[PDB]
Design a protein around this ligand. Structure first.
Ligand SMILES: Nc1ncnc2c1ncn2[C@@H]1O[C@H](COP(=O)(O)OP(=O)(O)NP(=O)(O)O)[C@@H](O)[C@H]1O
Ligand SMILES: Nc1ncnc2c1ncn2[C@@H]1O[C@H](COP(=O)(O)OP(=O)(O)NP(=O)(O)O)[C@@H](O)[C@H]1O
Ligand SMILES: Nc1ncnc2c1ncn2[C@@H]1O[C@H](COP(=O)(O)OP(=O)(O)NP(=O)(O)O)[C@@H](O)[C@H]1O
Ligand SMILES: [Mg+2]
Lengths: 300, 50, 50, 301, 648, 150
């Protein structure tokens, strides 16, 4: 009847509707192939809306409208179901696995576990139903997802904020970027994993020299060794963001020291060759530069 | 834009356009509207009162 | 036969739209779901512009 | 030509036509010379033959026989709320639009668009000034240009109800040499070009003027040096109009240059003695660094 | 200063140079050192520089220091423009060094994320470091727009004295000591310019004439050898000649960057050579030549003589061993290209080999690989990927739509075998990933991070695989037209102007191969007799004229002569050896006639088999006439026949 | 050769005639994939695992299998101007093997010859084939019979 012909076929389609499912490493069963049904639902909805144009539609309006109301609530939950998955998946790598990082974020993790378990129950009941349309009749499904995506986003936000506040304590961190920073925050137990990054946050310096308790110095990408005046004392539990700041200041202070020492030597009239062995490059250079300037000044 | 010969044959094609070749026409209309009005009016209502 | 309207600025598309009111359904050949959304307009009697 | 060639005689045409062809390098030859039947044409060839080109060019404009419309005459007479006035970088029409504002109905609002802050205050004061009625001026709109595409383009367009608002006029300063402005936004507004090019003596007077308003941070010699720099600026400034004569390419010398040149001078003055010797190293800095820094071609340096 | 005429002149000249002063005043030591230039003062931040490669002092670099100090004095950003091949970014870096600052650098259109660019800018403002945008001129509309706006927020805030500023919909504090520098490279349209918003916040200056001479002199002077001034002038003038005389080529760079490669690559040769011009000569022909072609090579040689006059045995005996082993003849050319490659592989991590089909590009790297294994003892793992057979997805890898699971592609998987888990030892061996196909911008855009100084392979999931030095990459391809100029500047380039091999040599090689193919499945008795028959049945003197008349002819879907050879020999051999069994009882004259017939036929098809069939007949006559007159003449329909039930 | 030259007629005839060779028919299209070619073979071929050559892909019996790509020059070019499917025929010809695309493991072909027929690049619709492919195949022009032949 131009109408019942279409309505039957929408129904016939949605009673055989199936989400493809493969579970990831632990727990939650993921869905492949979102777009298929998201499209087909959107397409059938459009067919149902436009039906209202028909002149013979008036009497069947009810039987149409019921279907519309069912599909519309599928759409309401589809839109949410997919982003809940996507966000969760992205967050699992950062939160659920590595113990050290979830340790300093008791909170984002403490929420993540509960969301996960709940999203696990709802999904597990969902794919037990052997049809996708059936999902609309699950009590507190739409509600569960909306609460879940909102909460996940609140976590994702919190994390982003946490990190950006973390960098601002030692701004050099802005050169690292998220992944590596998290490695520094967690490895602050060991102190030896921070050495890798000292090319990226300084660039002059390659790696860092320890007495295993104290930091004696650094070694530049060239292979020069800069020995600090005061070795930087470390305790078994101490934040990286602190001694890194102490370090950054002490390398400058140390360069300055070598500068005045060497320059004073040259002032006392030691041969440049004498000096070349005993100081780092930068110090004996600025030395030569300043002293030179003074000499060619009176020489003028 | 070039349509298939198949479309252009089957189809009744109409140009709503101002190509600058429309100016000759359009300045006359304005000229006549502002110069001889009563026959621009009775140009327009030619079908009306009829 | 089907009209083919050509205007550089398409004011004519809103002329047809004003003529048929809400009845007008506007489609494009370049939009994705066009093929079906045509099948919808055609079955239930919508006025189409492509 | 379009008009006269229709109205006037074939000897007229071929004469004016050959006379133009002479102004161009097209051809050189004597026009069919009719005596006092065409006075003006003899007046024109007289300009061409005496090699005074400007008056030869504006012969047509004075035989076009019109009163040109002043910026003021467009602004006032035009019914529209939106004007874009483009100019070469050499000159800005802000000072003129100020005087045109004071001259009629006041309400001068100068909005620079530097920052994110200048842009918020821009669109705040736009929505404020279009209810209140004042004149709003957006300086060098071209720099924010991704702003125009999103905000301004649509915010002029989507409103034809801006006329229903008070008597309100939004000016937009543009640059002829510079990024292309969106064609629809431009056609929607009344366009003008700001051509007014000061004399050399004028420019020296105006430069010299802006300086005494600063009070005295400096002594007597610096004044002399400020005087010189004004002159030097005015002369360089002028030479860039010359194009292949004088400077090889177009170079633009802004106030940024003048500031930096005078900043250097105050420094070299404060740092040295009152001897007249330091002039050695004053030239080199201004020529090679301050002013000549901008210059790639060694000829122009 | 000595040679200055007047005491005034000395003061001027003294004022144009950076002078280093130290306040004896107070505490706050790190602020105690400052720099005076042009009467403007700049303080010395004490950031540790290490031992960077220090730039030679030239007046251009000093003026650059002057414009930059001139700008910073009023807290405007400085900006450089000028053609590629001077230096700008590297000048800003040295300027930072001199004031004791490590300049952070953003290389633009490196496929960089805007996030990482935003983030680095935020770091630089909070830290207070000096940023430099390398080739700022090229950035996308939206990227450049946003970066620019932020740069004005910063630069404006610096001029104003704001403690905190606002940018990009991110709020940050601002160090008074922050600064932003910009370098701009030109397009075909003329010297690039700052976007309008930054034009008012910066000070533009030009980098023009690098003074290649004074650089070269001092570098040659720190290697401390011979005539520093003389060699400098001769080398600079010579590259200049090379630019004037040699053909304009997209990938030719004779600039200061090439000149530095010469002066630095001049150092290793000093050990086994002297410090004389001879080393300079050797370095030049090592660096320059590989890229040059037919004509340009002889130009290099001609203009080389006009100016300055003119591992060897070990490696060359290993190559000879490797060629001798694969059946390849060692020519001037083949050896030349081998050696060029061998010396390239030490310097260059990725190599590009360009030449027409049948050039011998493969033969070269395969042989040089094989001979190094002999020589160095480092074993070689070779993966040959025909690139454009695989999609980027297939090659590098991809991610599942929904589950966000990663799957390794071909390149990444064979890289993982090397790094993550080594069951065996890849440590003591060299790996070569060879890309056999045409190279397009897209695939190298994916791995440009490999070709980079970052030496890390970037996957979409952010797996960031590091790359060991054992890992070497080859591109063998016929044309460079479509590759990025950047891909070339990142790799070394070995150009093949002509065939590595004489036509007769290839023939001789093919025959060897065909003989050894028989040596496995056949007895030595037959093999000796037959291979003598084939080789001595045809000589290069007859053939060369035939190959020459083949060149005058109309070939539908033509393949050049050198490449037809493979068809020629392999057809002939198999054809002759097909009939080997009838040669035992055959008369001695009759075979030579048979061999000759089978060869004439195969030589006809292999050369003119693609011709009109009228031309085939004309070429038959050309074969009969240029081989022996007594020798069995070939005819259109000529064929060998043997009896059904009996041998005949 | 031109149309009616007898390319498809004669070669299909020659390969169906002999018992030693069997044909796999393929008609290249201006849209064709490597994966069409592989699937074209999978009826006549079988994968085996041999520690000698690692993975091998021979015919399902002893005698040789000839792949016939008719209208071989038709496949289109990438935006950057390269036709992968031909370069794939090349990889087969020169390297006697190919990478199995999904699993990232090297496949070696056995007793499989590649042969093709086409019309000169001069004609419309036809594409130029790279000397890097054509170097490995002997090319024969095929034209109208002697007319006395006709
Ligand atoms: N005064 C100098 N002393 C020594 N080397 C120099 C000097 N000036 C330039 N160079 C070298 O010239 C080369 C130019 O590189 P670079 O500075 O990156 O150029 P750029 O202008 O910044 N960008 P590009 O021109 O595209 O390479 C580098 O190898 C520099 O080391
Ligand atoms: N030095 C040599 N002496 C003798 N024969 C040689 C030599 N070099 C190459 N050949 C032969 O000539 C052929 C040339 O092809 P090849 O070595 O693959 O170079 P190619 O440029 O990589 N070919 P292509 O990959 O299609 O561009 C080789 O396959 C050998 O058969
Ligand atoms: N000796 C012959 N025996 C049988 N048919 C022949 C003979 N010589 C020519 N033909 C005819 O030649 C035609 C064969 O064309 P054919 O070569 O198969 O197409 P093709 O090779 O693909 N040329 P093209 O259309 O460009 O692809 C048929 O009409 C045959 O009848
Ligand atoms: Mg090859």
């Amino acid at each position: 009847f131009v109408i019942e012909k279409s309505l039957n076929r929408i129904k016939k389609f949605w009673k055989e509707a199936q989400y493809e499912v493969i579970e990831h490493s632990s727990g939650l069963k993921l869905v492949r192939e979102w777009d298929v049904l998201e499209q087909a639902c959107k397409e059938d909805l459009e067919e149902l809306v436009s039906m209202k144009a028909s002149n013979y539609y008036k009497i069947f309006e009810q039987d149409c409208l019921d279907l519309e109301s069912k599909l519309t609530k599928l759409s309401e939950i589809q839109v949410n179901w997919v982003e809940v998955q996507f966000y969760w998946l992205d967050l699992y790598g950062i939160l659920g696995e590595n113990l050290d990082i979830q340790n300093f974020l008791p909170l984002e993790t403490s929420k993540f576990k509960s969301l996960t378990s709940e999203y696990k129950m709802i999904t597990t009941r969902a794919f037990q139903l052997d049809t996708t349309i059936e999902v609309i009749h699950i009590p507190n499904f739409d509600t569960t997802l909306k609460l879940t995506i909102d909460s996940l986003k609140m976590i994702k936000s919190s994390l982003s904020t946490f990190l950006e506040r973390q960098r601002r304590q030692f701004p050099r961190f802005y050169f690292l970027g998220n992944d590596d920073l998290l490695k520094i925050i967690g490895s602050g137990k060991h102190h030896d994993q921070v050495s890798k990054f000292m090319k990226k946050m300084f660039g002059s310096i390659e790696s860092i020299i320890f007495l295993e308790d104290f930091i004696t110095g650094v070694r530049s990408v060239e292979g020069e060794v800069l020995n600090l005046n005061e070795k930087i004392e470390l305790k078994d539990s101490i934040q990286a963001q602190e001694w890194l700041n102490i370090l950054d200041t002490e390398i400058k202070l140390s360069v300055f020291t070598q500068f005045r020492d060497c320059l004073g030597q040259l002032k006392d009239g030691t041969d440049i060759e004498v000096v070349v062995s005993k100081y780092i490059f930068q110090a004996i250079l600025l030395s030569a530069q300043v002293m030179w300037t003074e000499l060619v000044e009176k020489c003028l | 834009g070039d349509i298939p010969i198949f479309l252009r044959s089957r189809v009744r094609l109409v140009h709503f356009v101002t190509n600058k070749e429309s100016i000759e026409t359009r300045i006359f209309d304005i000229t006549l509207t502002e110069e001889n009005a009563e026959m621009q009016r009775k140009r327009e209502d030619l079908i009306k009162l009829n | 036969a089907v009209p083919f309207l050509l205007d550089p600025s398409s004011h004519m598309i809103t002329v047809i739209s004003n003529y048929y009111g809400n009845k007008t359904v506007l489609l494009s050949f370049l939009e994705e779901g066009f093929v079906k959304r045509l099948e919808n307009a055609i079955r239930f009697g919508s006025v189409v512009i492509i | 030509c379009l008009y006269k060639f229709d109205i006037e005689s074939e000897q007229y045409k071929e004469a004016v036509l050959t006379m133009i062809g002479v102004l161009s390098e097209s051809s050189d030859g004597v026009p069919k010379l009719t005596v006092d039947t065409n006075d003006d044409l003899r007046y024109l060839w007289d300009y061409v033959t005496t090699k005074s080109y400007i008056s030869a060019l504006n012969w047509f404009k004075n035989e076009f026989f019109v009163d040109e419309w002043n910026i003021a005459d467009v602004v006032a007479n035009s019914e529209n709320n939106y004007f874009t006035m483009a100019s070469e970088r050499d000159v800005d029409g802000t000072f003129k639009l100020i005087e045109l504002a004071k001259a009629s109905k006041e309400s001068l609002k100068i909005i620079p668009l530097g920052s994110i802050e200048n842009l918020n205050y821009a669109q705040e004061e736009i929505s404020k000034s279009k209810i209140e009625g004042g004149w709003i001026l957006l300086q060098n709109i071209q720099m924010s240009l991704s702003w125009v595409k999103t905000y301004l383009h649509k915010h002029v367009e989507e409103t034809k109800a801006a006329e229903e608002h008070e008597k309100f006029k939004m000016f937009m300063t543009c640059h002829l040499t510079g990024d292309k402005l969106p064609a629809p936004l431009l056609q929607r507004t009344d366009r003008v070009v700001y051509e007014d090019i000061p004399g050399i003596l004028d420019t020296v007077k105006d430069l010299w003027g802006s300086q005494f308003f600063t009070g005295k941070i400096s002594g007597v010699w610096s004044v002399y040096c400020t005087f010189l720099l004004s002159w030097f600026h005015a002369l360089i400034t002028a030479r860039t109009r010359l194009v292949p004569h004088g400077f090889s390419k177009k170079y633009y010398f802004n106030d940024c240059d003048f500031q930096f040149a005078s900043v250097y001078l105050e420094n070299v003055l404060a740092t040295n003695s009152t001897n007249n010797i330091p002039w050695a190293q004053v030239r080199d800095h201004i020529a090679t660094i301050v002013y000549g820094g901008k210059i790639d071609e060694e000829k122009d340096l | 200063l000595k040679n200055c005429s007047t005491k005034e002149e000395a003061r001027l000249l003294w004022a144009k140079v950076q002078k280093f002063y130290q306040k004896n005043d107070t505490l706050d030591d790190l602020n105690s050192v400052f720099i005076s230039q042009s009467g403007y003062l700049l303080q010395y931040k004490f950031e540790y520089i290490g031992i960077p490669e220090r730039l030679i002092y030239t007046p251009l670099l000093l003026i650059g220091f002057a414009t930059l100090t001139d700008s910073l004095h009023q807290k405007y950003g400085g900006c450089f423009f000028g053609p590629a091949g001077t230096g700008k970014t590297e000048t800003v870096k040295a300027f930072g060094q001199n004031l004791g600052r490590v300049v952070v650098v953003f290389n633009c259109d490196d496929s960089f994320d805007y996030q990482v660019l935003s983030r680095l800018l935020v770091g630089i403002t909070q830290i207070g470091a000096w940023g430099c945008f390398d080739q700022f001129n090229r950035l996308d509309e939206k990227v450049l727009s946003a970066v620019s706006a932020n740069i004005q927020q910063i630069q404006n805030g610096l001029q104003v004295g704001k403690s905190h500023i606002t940018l990009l919909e991110e709020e940050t504090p601002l160090s008074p000591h922050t600064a932003v520098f910009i370098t701009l490279n030109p397009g075909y349209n003329g010297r690039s310019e700052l976007p309008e918003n930054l034009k008012k916040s910066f000070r533009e200056f030009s980098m023009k004439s690098p003074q290649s001479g004074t650089i070269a002199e001092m570098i040659l002077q720190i290697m401390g050898f011979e005539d520093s001034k003389s060699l400098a002038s001769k080398i600079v003038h010579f590259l200049e000649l090379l630019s004037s005389k040699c053909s304009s080529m997209n990938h030719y760079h004779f600039g200061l960057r090439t000149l530095k490669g010469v002066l630095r690559n001049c150092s290793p040769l000093i050990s086994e050579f002297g410090e004389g011009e001879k080393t300079v000569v050797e370095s030049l022909k090592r660096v320059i030549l590989p890229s040059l072609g037919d004509t340009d090579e002889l130009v290099f040689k001609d203009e080389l003589s006009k100016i300055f006059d003119s591992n060897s045995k070990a490696i060359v005996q290993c190559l000879k061993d490797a060629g001798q082993r694969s059946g390849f003849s060692m020519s001037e050319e083949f050896l030349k290209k081998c050696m060029q490659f061998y010396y390239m592989q030490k310097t260059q991590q990725a190599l590009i080999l360009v030449g027409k089909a049948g050039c011998g590009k493969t033969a070269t790297w395969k042989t040089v690989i094989d001979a190094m294994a002999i020589f160095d003892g480092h074993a070689n793992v070779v993966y040959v990927i025909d690139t454009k057979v695989l999609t980027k997805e297939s090659l590098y890898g991809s991610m599942l739509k929904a589950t966000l699971e990663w799957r390794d592609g071909l390149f990444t998987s064979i890289l993982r075998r090397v790094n993550d888990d080594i069951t065996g030892t890849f440590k003591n061996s060299r790996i070569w990933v060879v890309f056999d196909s045409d190279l397009d911008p897209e695939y190298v855009e994916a791995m440009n991070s490999v070709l980079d100084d970052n030496k890390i392979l970037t996957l979409p999931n952010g797996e960031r695989l590091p790359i060991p030095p054992n890992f070497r990459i080859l591109f063998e391809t016929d044309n460079l037209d479509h590759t990025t100029p950047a891909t070339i500047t990142r790799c070394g380039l070995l150009w093949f102007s002509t065939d590595v091999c004489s036509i007769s040599s290839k023939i001789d090689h093919l025959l060897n191969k065909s003989y050894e193919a028989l040596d496995n499945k056949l007895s030595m008795f037959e093999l000796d007799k037959l291979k003598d028959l084939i080789s001595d049945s045809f000589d290069m003197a007859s053939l060369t004229n035939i190959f020459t008349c083949s060149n005058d002819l109309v070939h539908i879907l033509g393949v050049r002569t050198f490449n037809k050879l493979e068809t020629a020999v392999q057809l002939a051999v198999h054809l002759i050896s097909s009939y080997r069994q009838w040669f035992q009882n055959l008369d001695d004259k009759s075979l030579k006639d048979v061999i000759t017939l089978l060869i004439k036929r195969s030589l006809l098809y292999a050369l003119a088999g693609d011709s009109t069939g009228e031309s085939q007949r004309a070429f038959i006559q050309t074969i009969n006439t240029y081989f022996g007159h007594d020798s069995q003449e070939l005819s259109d329909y000529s064929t060998i026949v043997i009896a059904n039930d009996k041998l005949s | 050769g031109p149309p009616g030259s007898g390319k498809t007629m004669i070669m299909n005839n020659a390969l169906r005639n002999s018992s030693l060779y069997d044909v796999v028919g393929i008609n290249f299209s201006k849209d064709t994939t490597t994966e069409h070619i592989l699937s074209a073979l999978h009826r006549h071929t079988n994968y085996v695992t041999t520690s000698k050559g690692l993975t091998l892909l021979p015919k399902s019996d002893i005698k040789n299998l000839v792949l016939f790509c008719d209208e071989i020059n038709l496949p289109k070019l990438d935006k950057y101007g390269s036709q992968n499917v031909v370069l794939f025929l090349r990889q087969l010809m020169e390297k006697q093997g190919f990478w199995k695309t999904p699993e990232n493991k090297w496949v070696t072909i056995e007793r499989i010859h590649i042969v093709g027929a086409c019309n000169p690049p001069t004609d419309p619709g036809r594409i130029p084939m790279s000397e890097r492919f054509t170097r490995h195949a002997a090319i024969l022009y095929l034209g109208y019979p002697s007319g006395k032949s006709l």
